[PDB]
Each structure stands twice: as structure tokens, then as C-alpha cells.
């Protein structure tokens, strides 16, 4: 799972 | 799962 | 799953 | 699990 | 199984 | 199974 | 598990 | 199993 | 099992 | 099992 | 050469 | 060469 | 060469 | 060469 | 060469 600016 | 500016 | 500006 | 600015 | 930006 | 930007 | 600015 | 930015 | 930025 | 930035 | 959101 | 969000 | 969020 | 958040 | 948050 990857979140950036989210 | 990938989210950027989302 | 991929979301950008969404 | 990876979160940056999220 | 391989996922990149997904 | 292969997913990129998906 | 990895969190930065999150 | 391989995940990068995912 | 291999995870990077994931 | 291998995890980096994950 | 591959560019996405770049 | 690979660039994403870069 | 690989750049992500860079 | 690999850069992430860099 | 590897840079993360650097």
C-alpha cells in the first residue's frame, strides 16, 4: 500500500 | 494500491 | 489500483 | 505499508 | 505476483 | 500476475 | 510499516 | 511476491 | 516475499 | 522475507 | 525511456 | 530511464 | 536510472 | 541510480 | 546510488 499526498 | 494527490 | 488527482 | 505526506 | 505503482 | 500503474 | 510526514 | 510503490 | 516502498 | 521502506 | 507523471 | 512523479 | 517523487 | 523523495 | 528522503 502506497500513499503520497493522499 | 497507489494513491498520489488522491 | 492507481489514483492520481482523483 | 508506505505513507508519505498522507 | 508483481506490482509496481499499482 | 503483473500490474503497473493499474 | 513506514510512515514519513504521515 | 514482489511489490514496489504498491 | 519482497516489498520496497510498499 | 524482505522489506525495505515498507 | 519511460515517463509517467514526470 | 524511468521517471514517475519526478 | 529510476526516480520517483524526486 | 535510484532516488525516492530525494 | 540510492537516496530516500535525502
Swiss-Prot record, chains A, B, C, D, E, F, G, H, I, J, K, L, M, N, O:
It comes from Homo sapiens (Human). Ubiquitously expressed. In particular, expression is high in pancreas, placenta, lung, genital tract and spleen. Hyperphosphorylated in hippocampus, neocortex, and spinal cord from individuals affected with ALS and FTLDU. Phosphorylated upon cellular stress. The chain holds residues 312 to 317 of 414 of the full protein. This is TAR DNA-binding protein 43. It comes from the Eukaryota. Homodimer. Homooligomer (via its N-terminal domain). Interacts with BRDT. Binds specifically to pyrimidine-rich motifs of TAR DNA and to single stranded TG repeated sequences. Binds to RNA, specifically to UG repeated sequences with a minimum of six contiguous repeats. Interacts with ATXN2; the interaction is RNA-dependent. Interacts with MATR3. Interacts with UBQLN2. Interacts with HNRNPA2B1. Interacts with ZNF106. Interacts with CNOT7/CAF1. Interacts with CRY2. Consists of an N-terminal domain (NTD) and two tandem RNA recognition motifs, RRM1 and RRM2, followed by a C-terminal glycine-rich region. It is linked to Amyotrophic lateral sclerosis 10: A neurodegenerative disorder affecting upper motor neurons in the brain and lower motor neurons in the brain stem and spinal cord, resulting in fatal paralysis. Sensory abnormalities are absent. The pathologic hallmarks of the disease include pallor of the corticospinal tract due to loss of motor neurons, presence of ubiquitin-positive inclusions within surviving motor neurons, and deposition of pathologic aggregates. The etiology of amyotrophic lateral sclerosis is likely to be multifactorial, involving both genetic and environmental factors. Transmembrane segments: none annotated. Signal peptide: none annotated.
